[PDB]
Symmetry: C2
């Protein structure tokens, strides 16, 4: 089966190993998803500044040996000398080489039966440099008000 008709079931797990199995990038897998919106990285400020208004979200960084995730409001930031510098908001700060972000995707899919809505920031190799996931309530369901705002952003970008 080719990649696009394969991603039309719903993979039993993460999108990263689908990319392996087809000798391709995470970005190429995301493009072939049933429900994804992919835009160039010059939409970074529009996407970032929009999510900053959504309330508590989860920001995630993945390395070979660590996953750190931060639940809370997305900090605002400013550009200086190639860096996007986060302003310290109740805990999380740091910097992003935002000009190395060449693509951004908004994704909706099931992950092990769980509705998910995420924003993926891609580097020039087609791999993820950062992920943001929508927040959840006490019964582990998405916050519908955030889902609505996410849908508004996807429509404004593309769809």
């Amino acid at each position: 089966v080719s990649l696009q008709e394969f991603l039309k079931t719903e993979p039993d797990g993460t999108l990263e190993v689908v990319a392996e199995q087809y000798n391709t990038t995470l970005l190429e897998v995301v493009r072939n998803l049933p429900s994804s919106t992919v835009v160039p990285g010059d939409k970074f400020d529009t996407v970032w500044d929009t999510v900053c208004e959504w309330g508590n979200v989860t920001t995630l960084v993945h390395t070979a040996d660590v996953i750190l995730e931060f639940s809370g409001e997305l900090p605002s930031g400013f550009h200086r000398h190639g860096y996007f510098n986060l302003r310290g908001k109740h805990g999380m700060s740091g910097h992003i080489k935002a000009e190395n972000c060449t693509h951004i995707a908004l994704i909706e899919r099931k992950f092990m039966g769980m509705d998910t809505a995420s924003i993926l920031f891609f580097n020039k190799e087609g791999s993820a440099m950062l992920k943001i996931f929508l927040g959840r309530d006490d019964h582990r369901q998405l916050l519908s008000e955030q889902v609505s705002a996410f849908h508004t952003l996807a429509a404004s970008l593309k769809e």
Copy 2:
């Protein structure tokens, strides 16, 4: 000219640049610092559980394109199926492949004239998988109560 001689006089920037400039690993640079304590990765639980008592610290992860840092209390965690899983309370959670941590270092040095005190967790290639830095006050000075606790941990790591 040699690495240890070069480090006896405080480099003007980060320690990775020194390893870059010397074509070696960050761990080898850290070993040759004037003020460092290096222990094996089996001290992970002792180090982690100790820092969890220190108050607000800064935990940092560094990738090619992102640095994220979290200021606050270090979350406790539990081991399961090879992961150390954080019980994220006030924001930061996640998981660490702690059995891939082969060395831990406690470091004190000046960074651009600033006293700093850090804990570096190393992978088997001798590079950093995670960093924890001591907290600061509004004048950007270290919290001396944390520095004292850091010194207590370094002394205890030198028992074995």
